[PDB]
């Protein structure tokens, strides 16, 4: 239809009708489902003319067309988004957010989300130019269901990208300004709004314990636990990610998670047909079992030890490695009674059966778990029994075969274990 030269000539004219004609042509050219000529429009020096058109309040059509074109230019490579940013598009879009026309302000939300989604640098740029205030003003209405069809989803996504990325992490004041709205949205009844809100809280929980403490003090943990049980995987995945990132912090934050009732959902999460759900749940549990002894006892009371043993037995090697870590932390900081309950639930057989793995990490982890269980047995004066069990499970053969392992740590472990219990 239109060539880059024709679009340049139309946009370089002074006739607003022709300028809008060429801007619409550029939108369609860059909206092509295949090979959009983004680099050719960039090389033609058109981004600045687009950022200028964004300010033509007199012609809202060309405002919309230029916003669309710039958004689809910033939707590609990081260098094309850099081009859009250098043209001064961030302040123009932030000002357009307040446009009386809802579609133009929605396109502006979209553009700012694409820009801030490139990385932490452009995110902090969008934040510095003052985007959070108007974006959240668009949601000030007490009832979120009064907002137009689709506006809330776009604004939630853009706010998620404004909480995304690390090195540097989002400015603290920005997170504290956005978190209450994220709570309100976490209590919304739209599946996609919930999904993006959980992803945003996940980004915010992935970091130091201070950020986790911010998120927890806002009081999202109960609603996150509620969403853990949602029927929508797009909602459970981010919710489980956030819950797992929270328990990686202090034992008080882990206890907040436990008190919210999260451990009651893990019997299903650890048996979810999706393997990623199983792996994330097992990793979260491994972080939980690495806590205080009372937290291990709460894991026991919720009946999760059977499920952790079951995932150590029947899951894939990824979830099985997470489960090995979980059981090793269970035995490392647990009580002799809890370790005895673990052995009663049948951990010896899976721990043995996983000693024939190529990953040296899981080998060392399981060896340490065995040493801890043996220390517990020694406290209980029943190490001969446990050695007989490992024998019956063919363990002794496994630990002896590990004597010929290249890694000095696995060899030395197996050697100490054999010399101390199997000699």
């Amino acid at each position: 239809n239109w060539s880059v030269e024709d679009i340049v000539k139309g946009i370089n004219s002074n006739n607003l009708e022709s300028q809008l004609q060429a801007t619409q042509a550029a939108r369609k050219l860059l909206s092509r489902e295949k090979q959009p000529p983004i680099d050719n429009i960039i090389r033609a020096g058109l981004i600045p003319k687009f950022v200028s058109f964004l300010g033509k309040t007199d012609c809202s059509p060309i405002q919309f067309e230029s916003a669309w074109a710039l958004t689809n230019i910033a939707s590609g490579t990081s260098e094309q988004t850099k081009a859009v940013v250098d043209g001064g598009a961030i302040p123009a879009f932030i000002s357009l957010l307040a446009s009386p026309h809802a579609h133009i302000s929605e396109q502006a939300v979209w553009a700012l989300g694409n820009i801030a989604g490139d990385g932490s640098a452009f995110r902090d740029l969008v934040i510095k130019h003052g985007a959070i205030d108007p974006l959240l003003a668009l949601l000030a209405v007490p009832d979120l269901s009064t907002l137009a069809c689709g506006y809330l989803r776009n604004l939630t996504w853009t706010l998620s990208n404004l909480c995304r990325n690390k090195n540097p992490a989002p400015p603290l004041d920005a997170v504290e300004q956005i978190l209450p709205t994220l709570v309100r949205l976490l209590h919304h009844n739209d599946p996609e709004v919930l999904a993006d809100s959980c992803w945003a809280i996940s980004y915010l929980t992935d970091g130091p314990n201070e950020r986790i403490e911010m998120v927890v003090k806002k009081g999202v943990v109960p609603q996150l636990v509620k969403l853990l049980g949602a029927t929508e995987l797009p909602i459970v995945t981010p919710a489980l990610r956030a819950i797992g990132n929270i328990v990686t912090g202090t034992d008080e934050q882990t206890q907040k998670v436990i008190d919210a009732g999260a451990l009651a959902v893990f019997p299903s999460l650890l048996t979810n047909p999706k393997t990623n759900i199983q792996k994330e749940a097992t990793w979260t549990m491994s972080n939980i079992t690495a806590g205080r002894q009372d937290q291990i006892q709460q894991v026991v009371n919720h009946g999760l030890v059977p499920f952790l043993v079951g995932v150590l037995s029947k899951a894939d090697f990824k979830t099985q490695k997470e489960a090995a870590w979980a059981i090793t932390n269970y035995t490392s900081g647990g009580t002799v009674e809890q370790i005895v309950y673990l052995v009663h639930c049948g951990i010896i057989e899976p721990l043995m059966n996983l000693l024939s793995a190529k990953d040296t990490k899981i080998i060392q982890v399981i060896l340490d778990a065995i040493s801890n269980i043996f220390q517990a047995a020694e406290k209980l004066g029943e190490t001969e029994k446990l050695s007989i069990m490992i024998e019956e499970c063919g363990g002794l053969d496994k630990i002896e075969a590990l004597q010929r392992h290249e890694n000095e740590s696995v060899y030395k472990a197996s050697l100490n274990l054999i010399e101390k219990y199997f000699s």
């Binding site: 958004t71 689809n72 910033a74 939707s75 590609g76 988004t81 979209w110 989300g113 694409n114 989604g117 490139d118 996504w157 998620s160 990208n161 995304r164 999904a195 993006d196 992803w199 992935d206 995945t237 990610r241 797992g244 990132n245 990686t248 990623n276 994330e280 990793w283 491994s286 972080n287 690495a290 806590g291 870590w325 932390n329």
Partner: peptide, 12 residues
């Protein structure tokens, strides 16, 4: 204690 589908980074 150790640490470790996502929404799109850019759209349309």
């Amino acid at each position: 204690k150790r640490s470790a589908q996502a929404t799109p980074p850019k759209k349309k």
